Amino acid sequence: VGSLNCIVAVSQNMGIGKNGDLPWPPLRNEFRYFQRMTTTSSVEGKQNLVIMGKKTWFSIPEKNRPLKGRINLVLSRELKEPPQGAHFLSRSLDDALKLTEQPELANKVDMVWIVGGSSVYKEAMNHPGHLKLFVTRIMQDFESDTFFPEIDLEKYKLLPEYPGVLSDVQEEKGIKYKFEVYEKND
């Protein structure tokens, strides 16, 4: 796999979670952006793969699990089989990417999306090679108990624009936010 993508939404105080859910109220178009980015593939015969930690998996509503139209892979050191409804289980990120090269997934995976949590993001951001970070900046402070690791600007560049990503400040339910894309190359 020659490229990874991470996708996250983060408050001004770098918060990404509180009590097993988002720190802010549900933002419907922001969620629709997450669903569009992670689901869309124009390559016939292939699907995107989403990779997440176990707490993030259990943070998804049961009726929405697995994420539809995507291959769902959970990372866990303790499980022996995927949680109920998930497609694959791997002991680490390196192992997950290697799994995509094996027969079952060989002709099947287009893009790879890391969708949390903290430790998964941290590991992905230091992975060698090309990597993009799709970061939604929620432009307020929210009480949080889980945080996004610092973006190393020695490695990552904020892109001035990106095709298919809106550049202006957005607003839903009185909360302002903006979509950012960062890239590193190694």
Ligand X SMILES: NC(=O)C1=CN([C@@H]2O[C@H](COP(=O)(O)OP(=O)(O)OC[C@H]3O[C@@H](n4cnc5c(N)ncnc54)[C@H](OP(=O)(O)O)[C@@H]3O)[C@@H](O)[C@H]2O)C=CC1
Ligand Y SMILES: COc1cc(Cc2cnc(N)nc2N)cc(OC)c1OC
Catalytic residues: 22, 30
Residue 10 interacting with ligand Y (CB under 6 A)? no
For the chain, give the number of residues: 186
- Which residues 6+ apart lie within 8 Å of 169 measured at CB? 139, 176, 177, 178
* Residue 146 parent element (H or E): strand 146-147
Residue among 54, 70, 132, 184 that touches ligand X (CB under 6 A): 54
User: What separation in angstroms does the CA of 107 have from each of 90, 99, 102, 104, 127?
Assistant: 19, 12, 9, 8, 23
Determine the interface stretch with ligand Y among 29-37, 71-79, 144-152, 165-173 (rule: CB under 6 A).
Answer: 29-37
Least distance from ligand Y to the Cβ atom of residue 11, Å:
12
Task: Report the phi/psi class of residue 135: left, alpha or beta, with left for phi > 0 and alpha for psi in -120 to 50.
Answer: beta
Distance from C-alpha of 25 to C-alpha of 23, rounded to nearest angstrom: 7
Question: From ligand X, ligand Y, none, which one binds at residue 123 (CB under 5 to 8 Å depending on kind)?
Answer: ligand X
The residues in 49-68 that bind ligand Y, with binding defined as CB under 6 A, are: 52, 56, 60, 64
Taken in order 161, 129, 150, 146, the sign of the CA dihedral is: positive
Residue among 5, 11, 15, 30 that touches ligand Y (CB under 6 A): 30
Distance from C-alpha of 43 to C-alpha of 88, rounded to nearest angstrom: 22
Provide the binding-site residues for ligand Y, judged by CB under 6 A: 7-9, 30-31, 34, 52, 56, 60, 64, 115-116, 136
Residues of each annotated binding site for NADP(+):
9, 15-21, 54-56, 76-78, 116-123
Provide the binding-site residues for ligand X, judged by CB under 6 A: 8-9, 16-17, 20-22, 52-56, 59, 75-79, 91-93, 115-120, 123, 146
Residues of each annotated binding site for substrate:
30-35, 64, 70
